[PDB]
Design a protein around this ligand. Structure first.
Ligand SMILES: NC(=O)C1=CN([C@@H]2O[C@H](COP(=O)(O)OP(=O)(O)OC[C@H]3O[C@@H](n4cnc5c(N)ncnc54)[C@H](O)[C@@H]3O)[C@@H](O)[C@H]2O)C=CC1
Ligand SMILES: NC(=O)C1=CN([C@@H]2O[C@H](COP(=O)(O)OP(=O)(O)OC[C@H]3O[C@@H](n4cnc5c(N)ncnc54)[C@H](O)[C@@H]3O)[C@@H](O)[C@H]2O)C=CC1
Ligand SMILES: NC(=O)C1=CN([C@@H]2O[C@H](COP(=O)(O)OP(=O)(O)OC[C@H]3O[C@@H](n4cnc5c(N)ncnc54)[C@H](O)[C@@H]3O)[C@@H](O)[C@H]2O)C=CC1
Ligand SMILES: CC(=O)N[C@H]1[C@@H](OP(=O)(O)OP(=O)(O)OC[C@H]2O[C@@H](n3ccc(=O)[nH]c3=O)[C@H](O)[C@@H]2O)O[C@H](C(=O)O)[C@@H](O)[C@@H]1O
Ligand SMILES: CC(=O)N[C@H]1[C@@H](OP(=O)(O)OP(=O)(O)OC[C@H]2O[C@@H](n3ccc(=O)[nH]c3=O)[C@H](O)[C@@H]2O)O[C@H](C(=O)O)[C@@H](O)[C@@H]1O
Ligand SMILES: CC(=O)N[C@H]1[C@@H](OP(=O)(O)OP(=O)(O)OC[C@H]2O[C@@H](n3ccc(=O)[nH]c3=O)[C@H](O)[C@@H]2O)O[C@H](C(=O)O)[C@@H](O)[C@@H]1O
Lengths: 342, 342, 347
């Protein structure tokens, strides 16, 4: 039979979930949906005809989805995942999996303890552009890696923060790093390797929010590479750049675009057949741009059919969450913060 | 009459100075050359017909240049400049002006006290590209500046350091930040304003030298902007980039190329005449690539001729020298180092 | 200018315990060098030394420099005088051969070096073990990349110095004059860290005076990290029961393993490399050689000094060479005193 998914939180990103599932809606279906907001609740059942619950506990008491998708305010992810795990179901959390390190740790434990799956959505990893780099690195083509820089120079006006009380709060959301660039902070670990320590500066330069809208982290990996990630939601007058550059002994790559959609530099000491898949990898990522979930849910659904291991499990999500925390302790504390965290 | 320059150090950069003085042949001439190495003193003689000395002290007992140009190993610059000033002549010091903060302050006090002028060579400040950026920043066209990123991704092979013992040594050179990237570190204070603090990592990842071939500094300006400068001489397989990117409230500029020589992104809320100077700045800055000494001399000569004041006098050199020093202290000590220095 | 047309004239300052190896090393090159002068503050050691040498005696360094003509002065005094003696020697315009270590304080060692630089004189620092045949072979393999990436380095100085050693002279075991186990005895071994393996990034040290009645440490340990990433330690005590047990270095890498044991890095014990080299056959011979000049190492060091002074060479261990180990000792002594990692290079 089909995987029964239920969706908690019917908001802005909910549609890509409904979208990705329905796109597989022959190895799975969307059976229930949940939101504490009458209107958005209405709207979503109106849109899918799954059974509407106006809170998670009612949905868990009565529904029977094999797996709940958390698309609520991020700070509620860990508590929801724990309740969902207590009711004995699998968990797909949107990113970031938590706004606090200890909550992130508890979610993973709770899921371990209940013997249920915990997936964290990191769809950007399935960019064709990014996949090429990943394989490049995996096969040793860079040889020793030396310098890595990530820019996220995007835009978010006051209105965007004002559309929802939770937005920009430490407890629910985090700032530009935890929310918008968490996808890029993820590359750091996933693509180049384990990070040894970071130092960061952040501030709230212009928006009325609690968290940061701007920041920098210098980074040092365990194998010794160094680098920065540089992030603002204040760019004028719109998204300028979402990029990663990686320089090594025998390889140089830059993945440009507004979202790591365009490989601008690709140079290597020795040839490999991927040298010729560049223009069209730029092709597939740019046309899936903003719609990586379908591909995400194909690994979910394969892992649940006992076919695969999850590509992004709770522990994987902890990698990026540890880094954000490091960056946030560094900025608040004015001190280098090393990994892994206690 | 023509201004009379002496050159101290007839090594690799000597030709560009020779080049540039001859190019103001009617306002000045190279009268004296000096190198402690018989062989390149000879050839610098053959090629200019100026009068050769074999030590600076003899050139100063016997010669009469109004201005001596120090193109020796950087660690020698402060000690030569003190001797020169002591002998009542003007100092043109190649970059960087010193390798130790204290030596730099000392060379400044001696030029002050002797009544001599002290110029530090930062030719890049003359780039037509950066002059437009400077002017937009001074006219306030960016509004509040928020994020600044600078990359120096260049290539020096081991055979480049192997050419002269002085190279890559802490005493005489410093590493990739203090030698090659100082023109870029120079930009942080010159264009964007006083820096408040830095945190840096550096390392010798590949070259056989004392100092770093690779590094990153995270930075916070007094006005609140944050940024980073990322540097490496290990780029594959040759120079990739020398770039500055500045994002403010109503402005977004990026100067790309291998050497801040092509304005790549230029966007502003309100228009201004210079908007139309851009293709010109790019052609002119790129066309003088490898050769901006001519332009630097113009000001040097305009100033000795009692016209202007120095674009880059000794305290100006002190500005990047202080940042370079905070970067090195921070990288060595693993802490944020704040300015101004003791 | 080089001294090419007449034997080098050396002067010896300090006629105490090690002076006898200098006097005899110099005499072992009687054809290129001679000892013409000797200076001691102690009427009687000077007495012994003149009768012993037939050199001209002087009872203070000022006098020896005012009336003497030596081309180079050898500094064989308590370690904390070397800086100040080297600066006055240099102001009178002659070369300086300073005994190890070149000073006991970082700033004094910098000032020694600057002074010689601005006098245009040579400053050599005695580091005889560098000429050891065993350590030369290791140096050669490290220099031709035979170890690959170096990972782990350990150095042991497990030696014996009884209280009566320290009491023999008042200056011994004092911070100002001597320093402790690290700065006096194991400095030849601290020297190997940078000389052999490469630039040190930082150290953490514990030291203590566990038994001797002296000021400085008689026992300690330093943890190390190198800039290229290897780690290791240096383990030092002058309290070994009942006499010297070990003076050793072990270097471990991707394709090389080397251990130099003995009481004084005089006997290569382990030696394994991924790819063969003629030097592989030179080991037993190098052991026998280094062992055979155990205690009499100076003759070899002076070969190089004389060459350098004759214009043949650059010195193997000049002033800056000598600052490299002074800087580690300083870092090790500041780390022990303050309880924090001390990174290099020093301000
Ligand atoms: N992977 C990705 O590309 C993206 C991930 N996200 C993440 O997904 C989550 C999406 O947030 P958005 O859709 O963008 O903001 P949102 O405000 O549009 O979503 C709001 C929905 O959740 C509801 N909600 C609030 N409290 C609830 C509760 N206790 N129970 C159930 N529903 C509750 C809101 O009333 C509304 O129904 C966030 O964690 C965000 O980081 C968001 C966009 C993209
Ligand atoms: N502004 C710019 O674009 C550039 C600046 N530089 C800077 O210029 C200086 C020169 O660098 P290079 O030309 O690359 O290296 P270099 O090694 O090629 O030039 C060295 C010359 O100085 C001589 N020398 C050494 N000691 C001396 C002394 N006491 N007196 C007189 N001569 C002495 C050497 O024998 C040699 O011929 C450094 O400060 C370097 O950073 C270098 C290239 C470009
Ligand atoms: N390279 C090596 O293997 C060895 C190096 N050394 C070093 O060489 C120096 C030798 O110390 P030792 O001979 O063992 O101790 P020491 O006490 O035996 O010799 C000291 C001599 O210096 C004389 N002296 C003291 N003050 C003087 C002054 N102001 N001017 C001239 N002479 C003065 C003393 O009167 C005494 O005769 C020390 O730095 C020691 O670390 C010592 C033994 C071996
Ligand atoms: C994969 C990925 O990057 N996901 C992140 C990403 O998603 P998504 O791509 O959907 O953002 P979307 O581009 O729609 O712009 C959002 C608003 O910005 C405003 N916005 C946007 C762009 C711009 O140029 N100007 C602008 O005002 C405009 O108001 C837009 O409505 O932005 C999400 C977010 O910020 O909440 C993050 O939660 C995600 O993790
Ligand atoms: C304006 C400016 O950037 N000045 C700095 C700059 O000057 P200059 O303009 O001469 O650089 P130039 O590029 O010609 O090659 C230098 C060597 O690099 C090697 N080099 C260079 C590029 C490359 O791709 N590969 C390479 O090997 C090449 O073989 C060359 O021999 O480089 C100097 C330096 O590093 O010593 C710095 O001191 C200056 O501050
Ligand atoms: C090359 C080298 O290691 N140099 C260092 C070395 O020199 P040198 O070879 O002369 O030492 P020497 O072996 O004679 O023992 C010295 C006394 O130790 C006592 N000693 C020695 C061995 C032992 O087992 N027991 C013992 O009591 C016994 O009293 C010895 O008389 O020891 C010098 C010192 O300590 O002042 C250091 O300054 C040198 O830098």
């Amino acid at each position: 039979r089909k995987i029964r998914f239920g969706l908690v939180g019917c908001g802005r990103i909910s549609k890509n979930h409904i979208g990705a599932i329905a796109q597989h809606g022959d190895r799975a279906e969307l059976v229930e949906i949940c939101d504490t907001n009458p209107e958005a609740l209405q709207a979503a059942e109106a849109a899918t005809g799954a059974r509407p619950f106006s809170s998670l506990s009612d949905m868990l008491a009565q529904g029977n989805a094999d797996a709940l998708v958390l698309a609520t305010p991020s700070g509620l992810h860990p508590w929801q995942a724990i309740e969902v795990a207590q009711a004995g179901r699998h968990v797909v959390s949107e990113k970031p999996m938590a706004t606090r390190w200890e909550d992130g740790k508890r979610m993973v434990k709770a899921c371990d303890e209940a013997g249920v799956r915990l997936f964290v959505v990191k769809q950007n990893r399935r960019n064709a552009t990014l996949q090429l780099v990943k394989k490049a690195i995996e096969q040793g083509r860079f040889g020793r890696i030396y310098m890595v820089t990530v820019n996220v120079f995007w835009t978010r006006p006051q209105e965007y923060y004002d559309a929802a009380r939770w937005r920009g709060k430490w407890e629910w959301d985090g700032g530009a790093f935890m929310n918008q660039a968490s996808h890029y902070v993820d590359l750091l670990d996933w693509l180049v390797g384990p990070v040894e320590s970071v130092y960061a500066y952040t501030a709230t330069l212009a928006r009325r929010i609690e968290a940061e809208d701007t920041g920098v982290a210098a980074l040092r990996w365990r194998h010794g590479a160094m680098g920065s990630i540089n992030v603002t939601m204040l760019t004028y007058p719109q998204n300028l750049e979402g990029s990663i550059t990686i320089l090594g002994e025998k390889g140089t790559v830059r993945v440009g675009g507004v979202a790591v959609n365009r490989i601008d530099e690709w140079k290597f000491a020795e040839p490999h057949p991927d040298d010729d898949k560049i223009r069209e990898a730029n092709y597939e990522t740019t046309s899936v741009y903003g719609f990586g979930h379908p591909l995400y849910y194909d690994n979910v659904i394969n892992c649940l059919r006992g076919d695969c291991e999850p590509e992004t499990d709770g522990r994987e999500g902890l990698q990026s969450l540890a880094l954000l925390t490091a960056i946030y302790r560094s900025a608040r504390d004015g001190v280098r913060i090393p990994l892994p965290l206690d």
